Design a protein around this nucleic acid. Sequence first.
DNA 1: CATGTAAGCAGTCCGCG
DNA 2: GCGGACTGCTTAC
Length: 903
Amino acid sequence: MKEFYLTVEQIGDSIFERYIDSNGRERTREVEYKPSLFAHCPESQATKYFDIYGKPCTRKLFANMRDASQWIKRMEDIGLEALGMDDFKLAYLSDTYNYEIKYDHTKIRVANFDIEVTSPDGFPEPSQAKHPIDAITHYDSIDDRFYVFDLLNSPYGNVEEWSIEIAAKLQEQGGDEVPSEIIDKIIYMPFDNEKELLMEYLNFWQQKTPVILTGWNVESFAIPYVYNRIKNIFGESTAKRLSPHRKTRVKVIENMYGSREIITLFGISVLDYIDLYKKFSFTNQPSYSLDYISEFELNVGKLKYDGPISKLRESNHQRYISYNIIAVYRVLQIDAKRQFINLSLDMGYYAKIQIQSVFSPIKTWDAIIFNSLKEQNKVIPQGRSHPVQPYPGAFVKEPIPNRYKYVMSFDLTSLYPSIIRQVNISPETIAGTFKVAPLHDYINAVAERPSDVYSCSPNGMMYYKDRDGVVPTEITKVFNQRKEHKGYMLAAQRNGEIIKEALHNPNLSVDEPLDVDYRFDFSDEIKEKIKKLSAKSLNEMLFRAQRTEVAGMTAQINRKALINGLAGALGNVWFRYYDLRNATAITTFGQMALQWIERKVNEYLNEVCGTEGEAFVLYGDTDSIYVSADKIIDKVGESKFRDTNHWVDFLDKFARERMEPAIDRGFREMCEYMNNKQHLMFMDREAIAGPPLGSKGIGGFWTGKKRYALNVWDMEGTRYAEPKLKIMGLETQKSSTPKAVQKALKECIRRMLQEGEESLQEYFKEFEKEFRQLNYISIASVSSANNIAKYDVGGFPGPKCPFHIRGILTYNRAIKGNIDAPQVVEGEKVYVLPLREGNPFGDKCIAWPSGTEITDLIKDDVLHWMDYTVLLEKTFIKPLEGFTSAAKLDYEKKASLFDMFDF
DNA sequence: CATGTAAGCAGTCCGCG
DNA sequence: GCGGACTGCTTAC
Ligand SMILES: Cc1ccnc2c1ncn2[C@H]1C[C@H](O)[C@@H](COP(=O)(O)OP(=O)(O)OP(=O)(O)O)O1
Ligand SMILES: [Ca+2]
Ligand SMILES: [Ca+2]
Ligand SMILES: [Ca+2]
Ligand SMILES: [Ca+2]
Ligand SMILES: [Ca+2]
């Protein structure tokens, strides 16, 4: 097999590399790497190295990496550019793996672990590590085994061995319901004392050294706890055995509270699953406890136990250990679904970077572009210092707030990367400038053509049309991968709807799920077989289609994120190729494109409807337009449609056969106007929206920019079995909105859009009557809590103190000197509740850590003093009044003359 | 050592015979 | 009690 790296580190003048050799064996080597950098040299000198602008360079080969760094500083002092890759381990990887890396994940050791630490005096701080580690579960991906290290004797209690037989039993039979599929994979190791547990764990670690190290919150808890605990017991050198190179870096961050540490383990790639999740999931959660995320991702119930975690080991050691095991497994289950470890590996090896560098789009692109340019013997420019400078972004149309009955939307494919490719935007393709007219003159096609020679953006930039740019070249490759995966995702989604349709008439038979590839639209013959399947098989097929869809979503959305990240990187001062001319060439072109096509669509639809000057495009944001389709439907007349699906088919055909060609003609003309390299402005129909035929539903509404709701029948070619709400920006979409309120507001919208005013009023009346009976957590607001200390004046709110911060301070006083209460962690999320006047908490609100029950001692008072009136008004009534006033609807029946009668 | 900007809404402070 | 300037937070793209 071809060789591939596992990890790389620079330590002084040495590169330390863990890798897989040609026989599939794990190896380590220390290489005294001799790096090269470059300096501009006189033309006359015959060299083979050129910078990106074609200026000749001379190579400087250094005896070691220190000399190379020292030369960089001398060059800075002289005032001349020091060219080449200055992160030498990227140079090392590029030199060592001068081919496309094909890695074998079954050879890469992926470790998932977590630890337990009983603490009778508050949260066990990793920086102090003053309490025994009393459980470790460490799953190894090569062994496919859960190694369980269990402390039997502790200063906090002596306990019996954990029982695998009891662990396997149903909870309803007093067991722990450790999943049956992992019972046989558990290797259980009890220990009589912590020192031997830890020594054995370290020996184990030596035998089975993680390459990728992950788990839930490992970077801020488990890792520094383990490291510091070992340091305290055995000494720092022993603790450094966690690094295969025996080298660590300890980073301490302090504030007006305590101080935590992050530990860098050289030779390991730590990918905390919480960080992966935040980056790659495109959710925003109200809590990031593993209980909450597992429930959200997998629909499994919270791991329940009685009493405080500080007493769980002594009262129920059996459950304590089982829950440690299940917690490690849940992260594996989330990853089986989401496939973020897979994505990280793909991206890391594609770029030739340390795997943990996938968190940095700047590092990822620097490496990609470096490798691309190195192939052509080109020399990359020196990174420079740039002052931060705001710059203009996209255009958003101001909508008229209203109900909108029939809506069709259109969206440009991968807009910013498509602009890069169309215009040919790259550091080395800049041809010059032209004198700009106001943007409106380009939009209306009245400005003079910018150039008949170069490819242009309305920001004044010109680019060469006849040569390739590294940015367009490399962005296209990732774009093409993204497109492939998005196709798989959409196919799986269409396939799901086929299965949901067939679930309306399940067959009474004993059969099996069909063996199919869900990434491809089902054939007619598969559709025939599906129509004869039982509910059981259909449901299993539906689960599999949805899992296929999720896998496709991970793959495409994060590749989209990467390419869009390149367009944003051009506007980040830390990017080697930072250049506002290019960042701005993109955003300004986008503004033109949106507003140009708005004009073209208005013109086209007025023409085909035989009218003049009417506004069809009601809204647009960045690269999308929303077209009112009322006049289209009225042109033929609603009477003519047999059912909802009929008018949906009609609009679908209209968009594809009439509008899209006109949109295409409009953009091809724009491309000629800007004299661009390649026409890539591809704007396809997205949503078809409307009320069910014959109902009193309003179809959709806008309240303002970035705030709307639509009843959707078809989305990007997926014809839904059941209409689906597309809601953007409204409180239902915000993680700060209480859970039960999100639910209630969404049902309010559903009723407005599908059923009408009366249906809304009936629901509102019910919700208002039942509000007070909802669980307090379901109705609590949520907020992130930054700069808590900043506003903390002897436990009381300083000036301008935010509401949620005030709640935290109220909480801190309520739990003061009471060691069993969970602390609010800076930058994390809190539940928030308003309090009625005169409450024993001495203030107007309380806040506590999100995803948790409020501590038992103050829970009773919170429940008694909660201000339901304020809560209902702020979180529910006020947003709903926004929705209904925009929609020209009432959520409560208004008074009228009819009130004089007895109905 | 590290993607971007646009923009809505809740909240605090201040002005208000 | 509300609106205007301002911060904080969060979402749309
Ligand atoms: C998250 C994020 C970071 C940086 N830029 C972002 C972004 N989301 C959108 N944008 C910018 C770049 C996008 O090209 C543009 C339009 O957003 P949109 O979400 O339409 O995505 P787009 O890239 O066009 O991909 P599709 O093919 O799925 O439509 O808005
Ligand atoms: Ca635990
Ligand atoms: Ca788009
Ligand atoms: Ca599309
Ligand atoms: Ca059937
Ligand atoms: Ca869009």
